[PDB]
């Protein structure tokens, strides 16, 4: 059981804008939250979450 034992526990994740790892979502609405950045390491963040 190495499942979601880290539930709750709001956490701060820091990044730098690089070209192939993070990118803004191309949309009309102003981006807020985890929809601000998308990419491969963001996909790794989704898998880890
Ligand atoms: C996250 O917070 C919730 C409450 O805010 C914790 O909830 C309890 O979880 C245990 C697990 O068996 C239950 O028996 C309790 O009835 C729950 N209480 C409530 C008030 O929900 C939860 O454990 C927390 N997550 C972690 C990983 O600690």
UniProtKB/Swiss-Prot annotation:
It is found in: Cell membrane; Postsynaptic cell membrane. Coiled coil: none annotated. Glycans are attached at residues 1, 8. Sumoylation mediates kainate receptor-mediated endocytosis and regulates synaptic transmission. Sumoylation is enhanced by PIAS3 and desumoylated by SENP1. Ubiquitinated. Ubiquitination regulates the GRIK2 levels at the synapse by leading kainate receptor degradation through proteasome. Highest expression is found in the olfactory lobe, piriform cortex, dentate gyrus, hippocampus, granular cell layer of the cerebellum, and in caudate-putamen. Homotetramer and heterotetramer with GRIK5. Tetramers may be formed by the dimerization of dimers. Assembles into a kainate-gated homomeric channel that does not bind AMPA. Can form functional heteromeric receptors with GRIK4 and GRIK5. Can form functional heteromeric receptors with GRIK3. Interacts with DLG4. Interacts with NETO2. Interacts (via C-terminus) with KLHL17 (via kelch repeats); the interaction targets GRIK2 for degradation via ubiquitin-proteasome pathway. Ionotropic glutamate receptor that functions as a cation-permeable ligand-gated ion channel, gated by L-glutamate and the glutamatergic agonist kainic acid. L-glutamate acts as an excitatory neurotransmitter at many synapses in the central nervous system. Binding of the excitatory neurotransmitter L-glutamate induces a conformation change, leading to the opening of the cation channel, and thereby converts the chemical signal to an electrical impulse. The receptor then desensitizes rapidly and enters a transient inactive state, characterized by the presence of bound agonist. Independent of its ionotropic glutamate receptor activity, acts as a thermoreceptor conferring sensitivity to cold temperatures. Functions in dorsal root ganglion neurons. Belongs to the glutamate-gated ion channel (TC 1.A.10.1) family. GRIK2 subfamily. The postsynaptic actions of Glu are mediated by a variety of receptors that are named according to their selective agonists. This receptor binds domoate > kainate > quisqualate > glutamate. It does not bind AMPA without coexpression with GRIK5. This is Glutamate receptor ionotropic, kainate 2. It comes from Rattus norvegicus. The chain holds residues 423 to 471 of 908 of the full protein.
């Amino acid at each position: 059981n190495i499942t979601d034992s880290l539930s709750n526990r709001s956490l701060i994740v820091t990044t730098i804008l690089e070209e192939p790892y993070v990118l803004f979502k191309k949309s009309d609405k102003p981006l807020y939250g985890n929809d601000r950045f998308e990419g491969y390491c963001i996909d790794l963040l989704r898998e880890l979450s």
